[PDB]
Design a protein around this ligand. Structure first.
Ligand code: ZN
Ligand code: ZN
Lengths: 152, 105, 79
């Protein structure tokens, strides 16, 4: 039997989990078996493989290939003052400012910022669009303010 | 990394208030402009296959225990090359004692 | 021994290329974004042409359609 994580069924690991009543977080070989709704669509492999990808957990970290924490605020295009390497971002932040006039920079922007790049291949691979990332972030994070480039 | 010009000591960062101002235990301050604003960073799948194996790749054609293959070297036309496999990506590199490096690595 | 090696090799190179292409695009789409139900040319042009490999001339066209994509992704992976 395999030893690598997620399938740690080596030796006595699984028998102790049952007999010692270890909680959910202590399980090293946890599994589930999900049955596709409806029986006729359950017979198709192509429909099976895509739903499996949809239910899998995709977090931010795997969509990013580099991120940077910067000590800078934003007061629109009136004050500037940015990191030198990333000072070129205002070329699209100005595009973002006019393309998304509904959510202007708030009146309480702190002097901090995280700039993140996306691994487009992973986005292409697992079909997360830039629209879905931004919408989910803003709904989950309401003390942060969002700028993004254009994915096309 | 900021070192005190007089004490040669490491200076705290002390982000107050709209700028970055380094401070030493001797009370000296030097402040910071522009290029000091990078607080922290992390780049994924970087720092691998360039800095970890540079010495090993350089010495590989001279290692007796490295596996070798029958393949012509473009530079010195030696009939054998040194075959190298690095990483969980299994990147195959062919290197020669003449410095030929297959442009990979 | 009656089988011709040069025909076997050239068939395997197409079989390896097509298998690796579809193995790489098992979920991925040449135009990107999964969509292996019907959209674009991610999965099929009708029938079971994406796995059966014996209906012929559907893999010969589709793989040639996105041969450039296969070349550019392999070198990106091999880096
Ligand atoms: Zn000092
Ligand atoms: Zn050589």
């Amino acid at each position: 039997r395999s030893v690598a994580g997620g399938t740690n069924k080596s030796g006595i690991v699984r028998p102790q989990e049952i007999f010692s009543a270890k909680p959910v977080e202590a399980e090293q070989s946890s599994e589930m078996l999900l049955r596709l709704k409806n029986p006729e669509v359950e017979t198709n492999k192509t429909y099976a493989q895509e739903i499996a990808n949809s239910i899998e957990l995709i977090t931010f970290e795997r969509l990013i290939l580099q991120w940077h924490l910067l000590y800078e605020t934003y007061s629109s295009t009136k004050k500037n003052v940015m990191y030198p390497d990333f000072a070129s971002d205002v070329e699209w932040m100005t595009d973002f400012l006019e393309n998304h006039p509904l959510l202007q920079p708030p009146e309480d922007i702190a002097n901090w910022c995280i700039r993140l790049e996306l691994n487009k291949t992973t986005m292409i691979l697992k079909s997360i669009s830039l629209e879905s990332i931004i919408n989910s972030l803003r709904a989950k994070h309401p003390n942060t303010y969002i700028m993004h480039s254009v994915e096309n | 990394m900021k070192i005190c010009k007089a004490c040669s000591s490491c200076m705290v960062r002390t982000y107050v208030d709209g700028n970055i101002i380094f401070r030493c235990s001797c009370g000296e301050s030097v402040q910071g402009d522009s290029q000091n604003l990078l607080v922290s960073s992390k780049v994924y799948h970087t720092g691998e296959m360039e800095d970890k194996y540079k010495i090993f790749i350089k010495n590989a054609p001279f290692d007796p225990t490295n596996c070798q293959i029958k393949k012509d070297c473009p530079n010195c036309h030696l009939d054998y090359l040194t075959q190298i496999c690095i990483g969980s990506q299994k990147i195959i590199i062919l290197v020669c004692r003449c410095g030929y490096m297959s442009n990979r690595g | 021994g009656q089988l011709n090696i040069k025909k076997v090799q050239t068939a395997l190179k197409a079989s390896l290329e097509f298998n690796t292409f579809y193995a790489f695009y098992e979920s991925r789409c040449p135009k990107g974004g999964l969509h292996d139900f019907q959209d674009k040319k991610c999965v099929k042009c009708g029938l079971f042409t994406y796995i059966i490999y014996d209906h012929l001339s559907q893999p010969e066209l589709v793989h040639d359609y996105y041969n450039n994509y296969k070349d550019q992704y392999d070198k990106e992976k091999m880096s």
